[PDB]
Write an enzyme that holds these catalytic residues in place. Sequence first.
Site, PDB file in Angstrom:
ATOM      1  N   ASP A 179       0.833  -1.197   0.000  1.00 59.10           N
ATOM      2  CA  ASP A 179       0.000   0.000   0.000  1.00 59.10           C
ATOM      3  C   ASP A 179       0.875   1.257   0.000  1.00 59.10           C
ATOM      4  O   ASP A 179       2.080   1.211   0.281  1.00 59.10           O
ATOM      5  CB  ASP A 179      -0.949   0.011   1.203  1.00 59.10           C
ATOM      6  CG  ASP A 179      -0.212   0.013   2.539  1.00 59.10           C
ATOM      7  OD1 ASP A 179       0.339   1.064   2.929  1.00 59.10           O
ATOM      8  OD2 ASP A 179      -0.184  -1.044   3.206  1.00 59.10           O
ATOM      9  N   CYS A 213      -8.258  -4.413  -2.036  1.00 59.26           N
ATOM     10  CA  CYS A 213      -6.990  -4.507  -1.330  1.00 59.26           C
ATOM     11  C   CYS A 213      -7.363  -4.670   0.141  1.00 59.26           C
ATOM     12  O   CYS A 213      -8.209  -5.513   0.460  1.00 59.26           O
ATOM     13  CB  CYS A 213      -6.106  -3.290  -1.624  1.00 59.26           C
ATOM     14  SG  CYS A 213      -7.025  -1.713  -1.775  1.00 59.26           S
ATOM     15  N   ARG A 219      -4.668   0.813  -3.703  1.00 65.09           N
ATOM     16  CA  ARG A 219      -4.249  -0.082  -4.785  1.00 65.09           C
ATOM     17  C   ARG A 219      -5.419  -0.427  -5.693  1.00 65.09           C
ATOM     18  O   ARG A 219      -5.267  -0.486  -6.920  1.00 65.09           O
ATOM     19  CB  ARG A 219      -3.624  -1.364  -4.207  1.00 65.09           C
ATOM     20  CG  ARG A 219      -2.190  -1.179  -3.737  1.00 65.09           C
ATOM     21  CD  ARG A 219      -1.711  -2.308  -2.807  1.00 65.09           C
ATOM     22  NE  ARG A 219      -2.411  -2.335  -1.517  1.00 65.09           N
ATOM     23  CZ  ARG A 219      -2.143  -3.193  -0.535  1.00 65.09           C
ATOM     24  NH1 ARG A 219      -1.180  -4.109  -0.686  1.00 65.09           N
ATOM     25  NH2 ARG A 219      -2.833  -3.140   0.599  1.00 65.09           N
ATOM     26  N   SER A 220      -6.598  -0.670  -5.108  1.00 61.99           N
ATOM     27  CA  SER A 220      -7.781  -0.996  -5.907  1.00 61.99           C
ATOM     28  C   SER A 220      -8.156   0.145  -6.848  1.00 61.99           C
ATOM     29  O   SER A 220      -8.541  -0.089  -8.000  1.00 61.99           O
ATOM     30  CB  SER A 220      -8.967  -1.326  -4.993  1.00 61.99           C
ATOM     31  OG  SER A 220      -8.726  -2.509  -4.238  1.00 61.99           O
ATOM     32  N   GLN A 260      -4.726   6.735  -3.051  1.00 63.83           N
ATOM     33  CA  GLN A 260      -4.487   7.246  -1.713  1.00 63.83           C
ATOM     34  C   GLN A 260      -3.221   8.090  -1.590  1.00 63.83           C
ATOM     35  O   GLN A 260      -3.051   8.759  -0.569  1.00 63.83           O
ATOM     36  CB  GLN A 260      -4.435   6.074  -0.720  1.00 63.83           C
ATOM     37  CG  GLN A 260      -5.815   5.668  -0.207  1.00 63.83           C
ATOM     38  CD  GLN A 260      -6.456   6.784   0.619  1.00 63.83           C
ATOM     39  OE1 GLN A 260      -6.079   7.008   1.769  1.00 63.83           O
ATOM     40  NE2 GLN A 260      -7.408   7.501   0.024  1.00 63.83           N
TER      41      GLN A 260
END
EC number: 3.1.3.48
Length: 296
Positions: A179, A213, A219-220, A260
């Site tokens: 992440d 994730c 990540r998604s 993110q």
Amino acid sequence: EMEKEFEQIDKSGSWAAIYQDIRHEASDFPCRVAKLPKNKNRNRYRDVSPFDHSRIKLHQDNDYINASLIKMEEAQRSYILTQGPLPNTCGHFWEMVWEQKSRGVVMLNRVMEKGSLKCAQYWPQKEEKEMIFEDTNLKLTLISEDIKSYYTVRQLELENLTTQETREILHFHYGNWPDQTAPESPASFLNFLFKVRESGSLSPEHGPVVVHCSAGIGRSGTFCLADTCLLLMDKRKDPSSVDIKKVLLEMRKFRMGLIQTADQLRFSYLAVIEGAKFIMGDSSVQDQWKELSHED
Ligand SMILES: [Mg+2]
Ligand SMILES: [Mg+2]
């Protein structure tokens, strides 16, 4: 142009500013169902909730799962983004897979990351030890797995124990993408994305692919953003026609917090720019991605 813009942002060192503007402009919609007291133990993170308008509803007393339908109208692809299932929501996860008629599950995290459990063990690790989710009347069996150097592909059999109908579910499990950071290379990420594409799991004849994730946003979000951007160019056969930031803000209408970090935003540019080589008719770069991937 996306490539022009990327070089401008990179030389001015502006990725944090660019990313912060996206956060400031992002949609904000109510999450009232996610915040009901009865749903506290269904949320992995207090600050990551599905919007009411786009949340996936389970068909079978409490319909709540932390999962969002990202419906990209112009690209004509949908995704379900969801958190890593908790120990008490694994049955809900597979009920959602079943009711939404998804054919593929994309998992971008490891079960243990960074010293902590980011996801329940929601699929069987051994063929002879199938899983039964008694709350939702589903059986899940590991049929085979293809373990590559940095990702694994599994064939699962999901059975509805009431009707005895069975479906093949493909599990695409990314192994070395932490992440906050960017994947090692665009090549290895694109090689993985194109394996998911090649499986047929993204076809419109199936339900939306399920992507998660741990929180289902970082990540998604990177995975879906790159895929949608490449699909948009594919449709128009026109890479210039794609505004990555507009596409991301559109995705954020359906789930909060997608992408993110500024590093993940920058990587999305890198990935789409490299992926455009294949979209526009250089089919052999996909072979170079596999080589650069060292997947064997
Ligand atoms: Mg079965
Ligand atoms: Mg059935």
